[PDB]
């Protein structure tokens, strides 16, 4: 693959927050090892309950966020 | 929210909406419209 696109989707109190980062890659296996932080771009005041999601079409990865403390 | 920031403004509509059974009722800012 040539390009990596990463996103964060979280929905708190009616606000759907989207964070992202784009970077070039050269790897045909899985997510490259390394570190980068994603930044907010979009904030949609949807008021919509989200419990499930689907990706529309190139591999993709899905993880889940947890309320953990980080030192940045 | 309990930590709500904002202002609540209200006024009587007895001379506007009253006649009227078109107003229905049963997390913060949760809008459940299921029937
Ligand atoms: C978002 O939708 C889910 C259902 O997909 C709601 O979860 C249910 O809540 C009712 C409350 O009476 C429970 O009886 C169900 O068992 C719950 N379902 C599951 C699968 O856990 C959820 O409450 C909704 N949230 C908001 C904010 O609307």
PDB file of C-alpha atoms and ligand atoms in Angstrom:
ATOM      1  CA  UNK A   1       0.000   0.000   0.000  1.00  0.00           C
ATOM      2  CA  UNK A   2       1.081   3.635  -0.684  1.00  0.00           C
ATOM      3  CA  UNK A   3      -1.088   5.691   1.671  1.00  0.00           C
ATOM      4  CA  UNK A   4      -2.271   5.452   5.261  1.00  0.00           C
ATOM      5  CA  UNK A   5      -5.410   7.184   6.448  1.00  0.00           C
ATOM      6  CA  UNK A   6      -6.389   7.108  10.100  1.00  0.00           C
ATOM      7  CA  UNK A   7      -9.558   8.294  11.788  1.00  0.00           C
ATOM      8  CA  UNK A   8     -11.171   8.521  15.189  1.00  0.00           C
ATOM      9  CA  UNK A   9     -14.920   8.479  15.504  1.00  0.00           C
ATOM     10  CA  UNK A  10     -16.471   9.190  18.884  1.00  0.00           C
ATOM     11  CA  UNK A  11     -19.998  10.292  19.737  1.00  0.00           C
ATOM     12  CA  UNK A  12     -20.443  12.117  23.019  1.00  0.00           C
ATOM     13  CA  UNK A  13     -23.593  13.916  24.169  1.00  0.00           C
ATOM     14  CA  UNK A  14     -24.888  14.271  20.612  1.00  0.00           C
ATOM     15  CA  UNK A  15     -21.598  15.472  19.099  1.00  0.00           C
ATOM     16  CA  UNK A  16     -19.860  13.276  16.561  1.00  0.00           C
ATOM     17  CA  UNK A  17     -16.186  14.126  16.577  1.00  0.00           C
ATOM     18  CA  UNK A  18     -13.900  13.182  13.730  1.00  0.00           C
ATOM     19  CA  UNK A  19     -10.120  13.211  14.034  1.00  0.00           C
ATOM     20  CA  UNK A  20      -7.729  12.181  11.313  1.00  0.00           C
ATOM     21  CA  UNK A  21      -4.229  11.911   9.908  1.00  0.00           C
ATOM     22  CA  UNK A  22      -2.846  11.168   6.446  1.00  0.00           C
ATOM     23  CA  UNK A  23       0.671   9.942   5.696  1.00  0.00           C
ATOM     24  CA  UNK A  24       2.500   8.107   2.854  1.00  0.00           C
ATOM     25  CA  UNK A  25       3.538   4.512   3.495  1.00  0.00           C
ATOM     26  CA  UNK A  26       5.307   1.644   1.764  1.00  0.00           C
ATOM     27  CA  UNK A  27       3.942  -1.600   3.194  1.00  0.00           C
ATOM     28  CA  UNK A  28       1.692  -4.407   1.920  1.00  0.00           C
ATOM     29  CA  UNK A  29       1.181  -6.167   5.240  1.00  0.00           C
ATOM     30  CA  UNK A  30      -0.553  -4.259   8.055  1.00  0.00           C
ATOM     31  CA  UNK A  31      -0.401  -0.960   9.952  1.00  0.00           C
ATOM     32  CA  UNK A  32       3.237   0.314  10.074  1.00  0.00           C
ATOM     33  CA  UNK A  33       4.848   0.508  13.485  1.00  0.00           C
ATOM     34  CA  UNK A  34       5.410   4.105  14.563  1.00  0.00           C
ATOM     35  CA  UNK A  35       3.739   7.061  16.242  1.00  0.00           C
ATOM     36  CA  UNK A  36       1.636   9.988  15.111  1.00  0.00           C
ATOM     37  CA  UNK A  37      -1.256  11.878  16.646  1.00  0.00           C
ATOM     38  CA  UNK A  38      -4.549  12.515  14.913  1.00  0.00           C
ATOM     39  CA  UNK A  39      -6.158  15.946  14.929  1.00  0.00           C
ATOM     40  CA  UNK A  40      -9.820  17.070  14.975  1.00  0.00           C
ATOM     41  CA  UNK A  41     -11.266  18.298  11.714  1.00  0.00           C
ATOM     42  CA  UNK A  42     -15.021  17.855  11.872  1.00  0.00           C
ATOM     43  CA  UNK A  43     -17.631  18.151  14.621  1.00  0.00           C
ATOM     44  CA  UNK A  44     -21.174  17.191  13.644  1.00  0.00           C
ATOM     45  CA  UNK A  45     -23.973  18.073  16.166  1.00  0.00           C
ATOM     46  CA  UNK A  46     -26.033  15.136  14.978  1.00  0.00           C
ATOM     47  CA  UNK A  47     -28.068  14.157  18.040  1.00  0.00           C
ATOM     48  CA  UNK A  48     -28.111  10.651  16.519  1.00  0.00           C
ATOM     49  CA  UNK A  49     -27.647   7.429  18.539  1.00  0.00           C
ATOM     50  CA  UNK A  50     -24.796   5.278  17.077  1.00  0.00           C
ATOM     51  CA  UNK A  51     -24.292   1.676  18.127  1.00  0.00           C
ATOM     52  CA  UNK A  52     -23.104   0.110  14.868  1.00  0.00           C
ATOM     53  CA  UNK A  53     -21.183   1.185  11.778  1.00  0.00           C
ATOM     54  CA  UNK A  54     -20.112  -0.027   8.334  1.00  0.00           C
ATOM     55  CA  UNK A  55     -17.273   0.692   5.891  1.00  0.00           C
ATOM     56  CA  UNK A  56     -17.997   1.438   2.227  1.00  0.00           C
ATOM     57  CA  UNK A  57     -15.738   0.437  -0.733  1.00  0.00           C
ATOM     58  CA  UNK A  58      -7.728  -1.941   0.525  1.00  0.00           C
ATOM     59  CA  UNK A  59      -7.686  -3.339   4.094  1.00  0.00           C
ATOM     60  CA  UNK A  60      -8.965  -1.564   7.183  1.00  0.00           C
ATOM     61  CA  UNK A  61      -8.568  -1.995  10.913  1.00  0.00           C
ATOM     62  CA  UNK A  62     -11.018  -1.473  13.732  1.00  0.00           C
ATOM     63  CA  UNK A  63     -10.243  -0.951  17.391  1.00  0.00           C
ATOM     64  CA  UNK A  64     -12.176   0.478  20.304  1.00  0.00           C
ATOM     65  CA  UNK A  65     -11.466   3.440  22.505  1.00  0.00           C
ATOM     66  CA  UNK A  66     -11.250   3.263  26.290  1.00  0.00           C
ATOM     67  CA  UNK A  67     -11.234   5.907  29.114  1.00  0.00           C
ATOM     68  CA  UNK A  68      -7.563   5.585  29.945  1.00  0.00           C
ATOM     69  CA  UNK A  69      -5.047   8.169  31.101  1.00  0.00           C
ATOM     70  CA  UNK A  70      -2.184   9.155  28.830  1.00  0.00           C
ATOM     71  CA  UNK A  71       0.911  11.255  29.267  1.00  0.00           C
ATOM     72  CA  UNK A  72       1.379  13.187  26.044  1.00  0.00           C
TER      73      UNK A  72
ATOM     74  CA  UNK B   1     -26.409  18.379  31.549  1.00  0.00           C
ATOM     75  CA  UNK B   2     -25.662  19.140  35.194  1.00  0.00           C
ATOM     76  CA  UNK B   3     -22.765  21.347  34.076  1.00  0.00           C
ATOM     77  CA  UNK B   4     -24.992  23.061  31.521  1.00  0.00           C
ATOM     78  CA  UNK B   5     -23.863  26.423  30.229  1.00  0.00           C
ATOM     79  CA  UNK B   6     -26.527  28.487  28.546  1.00  0.00           C
ATOM     80  CA  UNK B   7     -29.741  30.440  29.190  1.00  0.00           C
ATOM     81  CA  UNK B   8     -33.361  29.181  29.400  1.00  0.00           C
ATOM     82  CA  UNK B   9     -35.981  31.527  28.030  1.00  0.00           C
ATOM     83  CA  UNK B  10     -39.714  30.879  28.194  1.00  0.00           C
ATOM     84  CA  UNK B  11     -43.038  32.625  27.706  1.00  0.00           C
ATOM     85  CA  UNK B  12     -46.757  31.916  27.736  1.00  0.00           C
ATOM     86  CA  UNK B  13     -48.409  30.867  24.471  1.00  0.00           C
ATOM     87  CA  UNK B  14     -51.980  30.719  25.773  1.00  0.00           C
ATOM     88  CA  UNK B  15     -53.010  33.125  23.026  1.00  0.00           C
ATOM     89  CA  UNK B  16     -51.064  31.282  20.332  1.00  0.00           C
ATOM     90  CA  UNK B  17     -51.078  27.503  20.706  1.00  0.00           C
ATOM     91  CA  UNK B  18     -54.052  26.891  23.005  1.00  0.00           C
ATOM     92  CA  UNK B  19     -57.419  26.143  21.278  1.00  0.00           C
ATOM     93  CA  UNK B  20     -54.871  21.915  21.164  1.00  0.00           C
ATOM     94  CA  UNK B  21     -53.768  18.239  21.482  1.00  0.00           C
ATOM     95  CA  UNK B  22     -50.915  18.322  18.955  1.00  0.00           C
ATOM     96  CA  UNK B  23     -48.154  18.400  21.554  1.00  0.00           C
ATOM     97  CA  UNK B  24     -46.892  14.985  22.623  1.00  0.00           C
ATOM     98  CA  UNK B  25     -44.763  13.891  25.583  1.00  0.00           C
ATOM     99  CA  UNK B  26     -43.763  10.803  27.643  1.00  0.00           C
ATOM    100  CA  UNK B  27     -28.977  11.107  28.543  1.00  0.00           C
ATOM    101  CA  UNK B  28     -28.490  14.960  28.086  1.00  0.00           C
ATOM    102  CA  UNK B  29     -29.807  16.172  24.734  1.00  0.00           C
ATOM    103  CA  UNK B  30     -31.111  12.690  23.886  1.00  0.00           C
ATOM    104  CA  UNK B  31     -33.996  12.966  21.440  1.00  0.00           C
ATOM    105  CA  UNK B  32     -36.028   9.757  21.339  1.00  0.00           C
ATOM    106  CA  UNK B  33     -38.755   9.946  18.728  1.00  0.00           C
ATOM    107  CA  UNK B  34     -39.633   6.243  18.574  1.00  0.00           C
ATOM    108  CA  UNK B  35     -43.390   5.421  18.636  1.00  0.00           C
TER     109      UNK B  35
HETATM  110  C1  LIG C   1     -29.097   3.530  21.365  1.00  0.00           C
HETATM  111  O1  LIG C   1     -29.728   2.328  20.827  1.00  0.00           O
HETATM  112  C2  LIG C   1     -29.532   1.134  21.670  1.00  0.00           C
HETATM  113  C3  LIG C   1     -30.194  -0.043  20.948  1.00  0.00           C
HETATM  114  O2  LIG C   1     -29.523  -0.376  19.738  1.00  0.00           O
HETATM  115  C4  LIG C   1     -30.151   1.376  23.078  1.00  0.00           C
HETATM  116  O3  LIG C   1     -29.830   0.233  23.894  1.00  0.00           O
HETATM  117  C5  LIG C   1     -31.031  -0.414  24.522  1.00  0.00           C
HETATM  118  O4  LIG C   1     -31.632   0.375  25.583  1.00  0.00           O
HETATM  119  C6  LIG C   1     -32.869  -0.219  26.128  1.00  0.00           C
HETATM  120  C7  LIG C   1     -33.376   0.738  27.196  1.00  0.00           C
HETATM  121  O5  LIG C   1     -34.726   0.467  27.561  1.00  0.00           O
HETATM  122  C8  LIG C   1     -32.568  -1.638  26.698  1.00  0.00           C
HETATM  123  O6  LIG C   1     -33.763  -2.246  27.179  1.00  0.00           O
HETATM  124  C9  LIG C   1     -31.974  -2.516  25.565  1.00  0.00           C
HETATM  125  O7  LIG C   1     -31.665  -3.821  26.069  1.00  0.00           O
HETATM  126  C10 LIG C   1     -30.674  -1.849  25.031  1.00  0.00           C
HETATM  127  N1  LIG C   1     -30.126  -2.654  23.925  1.00  0.00           N
HETATM  128  C11 LIG C   1     -28.894  -3.148  23.881  1.00  0.00           C
HETATM  129  C12 LIG C   1     -28.524  -3.948  22.664  1.00  0.00           C
HETATM  130  O8  LIG C   1     -28.087  -2.968  24.805  1.00  0.00           O
HETATM  131  C13 LIG C   1     -29.496   2.635  23.709  1.00  0.00           C
HETATM  132  O9  LIG C   1     -30.093   2.889  24.992  1.00  0.00           O
HETATM  133  C14 LIG C   1     -29.724   3.860  22.784  1.00  0.00           C
HETATM  134  N2  LIG C   1     -29.088   5.056  23.363  1.00  0.00           N
HETATM  135  C15 LIG C   1     -29.542   6.297  23.201  1.00  0.00           C
HETATM  136  C16 LIG C   1     -28.777   7.407  23.856  1.00  0.00           C
HETATM  137  O10 LIG C   1     -30.547   6.533  22.519  1.00  0.00           O
END
